[PDB]
């Protein structure tokens, strides 16, 4: 039989956690200020052993089996500031001992999460806490909040109620917490919010509920201080009227049923608005059309996500509409046309349009965006123009004039012919033309990209020959030519900066040191699996296999 | 109808709903502790009982029903001595004390089905089940048509109401008789009782200790 | 849940709501000769998703039998018991007697 594992003692810090203790130790020093009894088999907290440590300020009794609480247990700890009873059997504590938890004059943070607490039993257990600042009742079985639920804790400013079964909240339920600033109601069974009267509240989490309708009180005596509202994964059918929240900065409406573009049909209930908004997530909804009045109100908005919606047209044609919009995500919609007016989205750096149905567009749609950098048109069957000469036949989208664009993706665009002046004056650093079977690169199609290009990808194009002079791309670092029929590459006479070279699944037989003389110093990884290599016929590939190459 | 739904989010909610669904049907505030579990494989009697339920053949229906089975008294235990087996009826008697042990109160019973292992039927036949109502008389029950099969098959007859009467006001030994159908124009392993009932440990009418 | 109660309280829970449909008064139709009306009724009430915990108070478990009995990802208050409605109406000059399936709702369940 092994002797007991002792507690790890530090200066006024005693750690008895995960020692399999059945009872609170009584041989601990009286001057202890921090005690950690988590992860043991404590089934009750009596006042007799614990009361000897009057200097305690931080007491953690979490993740035990505590079901009994002696009425005077914690009152002896006159200096106690943090108490953690999380993950215990405290639901039956009131049935075993009367009075519940006692007064806690100095406790600032209390954790009662994961105790299977019930409505009524919670009100019996909770005691007066004048100094309480953080309270956690998460992972319990609370079905409702009454006007007499959170009493005698006026200093409370953070309340965590996530992972409960809350369904009903009485009108004056939070009247006793005027200083409340953070309220978390995530993972609950709320279905409809008729009122919002928390003036001093700043952060509100209503995610993962069934809230079909959300409505705030209108024209308050003072402006509501809410700046962070979360309504994701609900059943919202409408965009909330947030004109009663002037200071709101964050709003996540992702994963709802919102249509643009108040009634609660499942329940049967019916009863510059966002000039300060910064981040708005409307992704995963059922928005089919965007009203003209909707975008105009969203000034100073920096991020707008509309991915995974039923949108078919997006036109920001109003003068100066969405000026500060740094990012616009319209990916995976049914977008057939989009009208980005000139001098409209002036501060737009990222435009995500992959997974749409764009075909014909005005030639200078993306050219009017002043500070456009990232542009993703994957799976959009777009046809670039020839730039200065050989004007594109029909609605060719011009990529030649965007001097600020850096990264462009034309993957899965069924591009048949890449015309010569496609990017003559677009200093791209990355360009992805992969997944375009039958692509015909015209002579000099990568016109002005010799100086700027660093990443190039042509995977899956089935190319039998590469029409671009790769050695003159002095800044190119990563080149992807995988899944093609290429057999020969232009000779590298002078040293270049190419580091990664992917030639997997091609028709390469010989890679001679004549055509690979350059980039011997800069090459680091050379992918070549899937080629009909002539064994010992080339030579340079074997000598490079040692230093400065990969498999 | 316009496309916007990803099954990945739905699956996670369906899984989490199953977590509470099983716990609520079993009336478990928390998963039971595995401390007192005896080491080794499950007993053959328990595994055989679990195989009997999986075999193919009111508010309270949400909650789980405890499963027990009681085999009929052996054929050589006064069944063949006092009760003659004709060309039609086969007599299957059950110990009422053994039934009352598996189901302490008649109200707890939710379903009881007699199960038979048919030997082999190459030709269709119509059969009828009967209950020993009086000391000599037989009460008519359900009838079923047996499809031809070259292999043995298990048959099940719902006898929930009869077993409930046996639990309350039953004799020392009752049983059923299974005879072939006789139209007025015509003058001519072992079976067990599968029981489904509410456990006393989870009975609503008893206050928790 | 008692039907006599369901149709006698304004409570936001799943239940059968009383609704009688008069062809003349409610729909303005006179082409349905028989009957003059019927108790169609309807289901109404939230079936809130319950986020399940491994540990849970014993009495809270009853919520799953009512709010989400099937453990669906998005439970709905849908009818359970349904009854046909036979009618008599004229099509041109020939009278026709036809029975419409699943017209009267007698009980509602979360699904």
């Amino acid at each position, epitope marked *: 039989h092994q002797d007991k594992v002792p507690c790890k003692m530090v200066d006024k810090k005693v750690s008895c956690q995960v020692l399999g203790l059945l009872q609170v130790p009584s041989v601990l020093p009286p001057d202890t200020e921090t005690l950690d009894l988590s992860g043991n088999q404590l089934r009750s907290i009596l006042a007799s052993p614990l009361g000897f440590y009057t200097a305690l300020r931080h007491l953690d009794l979490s993740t035990n089996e505590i079901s009994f609480l002696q009425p005077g247990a914690f009152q002896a700890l006159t200096h106690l500031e943090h108490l953690s009873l999380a993950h215990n059997r405290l639901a039956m504590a*009131t049935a075993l001992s009367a009075g519940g938890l006692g007064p806690l004059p100095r406790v600032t943070s209390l954790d009662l999460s994961g105790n299977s607490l019930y409505s009524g*039993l919670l009100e019996r257990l909770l005691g007066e806490a004048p100094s309480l600042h953080t309270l956690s009742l998460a992972e319990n079985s609370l079905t*409702r909040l009454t006007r007499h639920t959170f009493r005698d804790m006026p200093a409370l400013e953070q309340l965590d109620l996530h992972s409960n079964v809350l369904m009903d909240i009485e009108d004056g339920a939070f009247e006793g917490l005027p200083r409340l600033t953070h309220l978390n109601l995530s993972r609950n069974s709320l279905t409809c919010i008729s009122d919002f009267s928390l003036q001093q509240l700043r952060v509100l989490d209503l995610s993962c509920n069934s809230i079909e309708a959300f409505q705030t009180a209108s024209q308050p005596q003072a402006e509501f201080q809410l700046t962070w509202l979360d309504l994701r994964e609900n059943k919202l059918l409408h965009f909330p009227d947030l004109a009663a929240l002037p200071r709101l900065i964050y709003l996540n409406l992702s994963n709802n049923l919102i249509r643009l573009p108040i009634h609660a049909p499942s329940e049967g209930w019916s009863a510059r608005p966002l000039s300060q908004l910064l981040n708005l997530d409307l992704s995963y909804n059922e928005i089919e059309l965007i009203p003209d009045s909707f975008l105009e109100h969203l000034t100073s908005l920096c991020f707008l996500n509309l991915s995974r919606n039923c949108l078919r047209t997006f036109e920001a044609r109003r003068l100066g509409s969405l000026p500060c919009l740094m990012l616009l995500d319209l990916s995976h919609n049914a977008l057939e046309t989009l009208e980005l007016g000139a001098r409209a989205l002036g501060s737009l750096r990222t435009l995500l349009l992959q997974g749409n149905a764009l075909r014909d567009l005005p030639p200078y749609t993306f050219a009017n965006l002043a500070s456009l950098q990232r542009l993703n048109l994957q799976g959009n069957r777009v046809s670039p123009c020839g730039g200065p000469d050989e004007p594109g036949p029909s609605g060719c989208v011009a990529f030649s004039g965007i001097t600020s664009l850096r990264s462009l993706s034309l993957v899965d665009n069924e591009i048949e012919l890449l015309r010569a002046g496609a990017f003559l004056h677009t200093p791209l650093t990355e360009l992805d033309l992969s997944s375009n079977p039958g692509l015909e690169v015209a002579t000099g199609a990568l016109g002005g990209l010799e100086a700027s290009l660093e990443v190039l990808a042509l995977q899956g194009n089935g190319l039998m020959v590469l029409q671009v002079d790769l050695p003159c791309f002095i800044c190119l670092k990563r080149l992807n030519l995988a899944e093609n029929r290429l057999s020969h590459l232009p000779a590298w006479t002078q040293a270049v900066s190419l580091e990664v070279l992917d030639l997997r699944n091609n028709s390469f037989s010989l890679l001679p040191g004549s055509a690979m003389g350059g980039l011997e110093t800069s090459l680091r990884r050379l992918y070549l699996q899937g080629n009909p290599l002539s064994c010992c016929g080339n030579g340079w590939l074997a000598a490079q296999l040692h230093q400065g190459r990969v498999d | 109808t316009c496309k916007t739904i990803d099954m990945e989010l739905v699956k996670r909610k369906r899984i989490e709903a199953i977590r509470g669904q099983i716990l609520s049907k079993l009336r478990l505030a928390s998963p039971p502790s595995q401390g007192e579990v005896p080491p080794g494989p499950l007993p053959e009697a328990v595994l055989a009982l679990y195989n009997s339920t999986r075999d193919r053949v009111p508010e309270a229906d949400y909650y789980a029903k405890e499963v027990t089975r009681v085999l009929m008294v052996e054929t050589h235990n006064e069944i063949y001595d006092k009760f003659k087996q004709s060309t039609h009826s086969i007599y299957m008697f059950f110990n009422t004390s053994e039934l009352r042990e598996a189901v302490p109160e008649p109200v707890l019973l939710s379903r009881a089905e007699l199960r038979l292992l048919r030997l082999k039927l190459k030709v269709e036949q119509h059969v009828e089940l009967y209950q020993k109502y009086s000391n000599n008389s037989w009460r008519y029950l359900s009838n079923r048509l047996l499809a031809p099969s070259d292999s043995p098959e298990w048959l099940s007859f719902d006898v929930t109401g009869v077993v409930r009467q046996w639990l309350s006001r039953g004799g020392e030994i009752e049983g059923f008789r299974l005879s072939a159908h006789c139209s007025c124009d015509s003058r001519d392993n072992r079976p067990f009782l599968l029981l489904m009932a509410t456990p006393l440990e989870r009975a*609503q*009418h008893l*206050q928790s200790s | 849940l*008692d039907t006599n109660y369901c149709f*006698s309280s304004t409570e936001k829970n799943c239940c059968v709501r009383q609704l009688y449909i008069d062809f003349r008064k409610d729909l303005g139709w006179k082409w349905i000769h028989e009957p003059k009306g019927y108790h169609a009724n309807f289901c109404l009430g939230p079936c809130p998703y319950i986020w399940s915990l491994d540990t849970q108070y014993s009495k*809270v478990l009853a919520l799953y039998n*009512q709010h989400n009995p099937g453990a669906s990802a998005a439970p709905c208050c849908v009818p359970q018991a349904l009854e046909p409605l036979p009618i008599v109406y004229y099509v041109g000059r020939k009278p026709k007697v036809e029975q419409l399936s699943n017209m009267i709702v007698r009980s509602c369940k979360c699904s």
Partner: antibody
Framework: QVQLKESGPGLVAPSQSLSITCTVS????????INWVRQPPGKGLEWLGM???????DYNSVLTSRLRISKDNSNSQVFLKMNSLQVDDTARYYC???????????????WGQGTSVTVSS | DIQVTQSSSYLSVSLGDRVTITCKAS??????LAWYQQKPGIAPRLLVS???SLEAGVPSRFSGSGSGKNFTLSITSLQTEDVATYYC?????????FGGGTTLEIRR
């Protein structure tokens, strides 16, 4: 409005069981608890037990085999059973609805008119 | 169990005078206590739920007070309709327990 009405046999023979049914209206039994309180002809209320909205039951400390409360939510009925009544069991038996302010409350707000139970044979 | 007791089974008082009914609990139930009124022939009616909160429809003349173990139901000015027996019932923990009652009587 809200109503509770008891249904008793009136007379009970000694050593015989007592059965009382508490019919309710205006509220669902799935969301409200029903207490059973009896009052003898002499002064004093005596709580017998209650059936919680989920069907769980708590009883008075002297209950052994003499108390059993069930209900039928679909029919808005609560059933009380009492075995082997004696002379001292002659009393008026009420059923009171629980004030469901909390899920675990206990305060009784709506009482039935009560039923007289006499054990005399 | 939590026993609850009413020391005075009878309390003499005249009309228009102040009346106070005491009811003590065996342990600190902290507010979880109710007050009931029962006419000699009528069924009991809830007067005070919690230690202080008056039920809807109760006259303002009645009032409750107390916390922990000691409690009291006060009547500001006694009326003829208040001549009845009063009970207290704790609900801190099951089983719910009643008091012995306090029947009011007119002094003479």
């Amino acid at each position: 409005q809200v109503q509770l009405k008891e249904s008793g046999p009136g007379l009970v023979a000694p050593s015989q069981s007592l059965s009382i049914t508490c019919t309710v209206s205006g509220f669902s039994l799935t969301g409200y608890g029903i207490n059973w309180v009896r009052q003898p002809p002499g002064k004093g209320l005596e709580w017998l037990g209650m059936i919680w909205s989920d069907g769980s039951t708590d009883y008075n400390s002297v209950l052994t085999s003499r108390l059993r409360i069930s209900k039928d939510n679909s029919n808005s009925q609560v059933f009380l059973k009492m075995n082997s009544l004696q002379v001292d069991d002659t009393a008026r038996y009420y059923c009171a609805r629980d004030r469901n302010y909390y899920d675990y409350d206990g305060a009784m707000d709506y009482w039935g008119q009560g039923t007289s139970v006499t054990v005399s044979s | 169990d939590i026993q609850v007791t009413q020391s005075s089974s009878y309390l003499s008082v005249s009309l228009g005078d102040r009346v106070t009914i005491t009811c003590k609990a065996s342990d600190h139930i902290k507010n979880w206590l109710a007050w009931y009124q029962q006419k000699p022939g009528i069924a009991p009616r809830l007067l005070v739920s919690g230690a202080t909160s008056l039920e809807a429809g109760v006259p303002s003349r009645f009032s409750g007070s107390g916390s922990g173990k000691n409690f009291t139901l006060s009547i500001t000015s006694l009326q003829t309709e208040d001549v009845a027996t009063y009970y207290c019932q704790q609900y801190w923990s099951t089983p719910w327990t009643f008091g012995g009652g306090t029947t009011l009587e007119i002094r003479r």
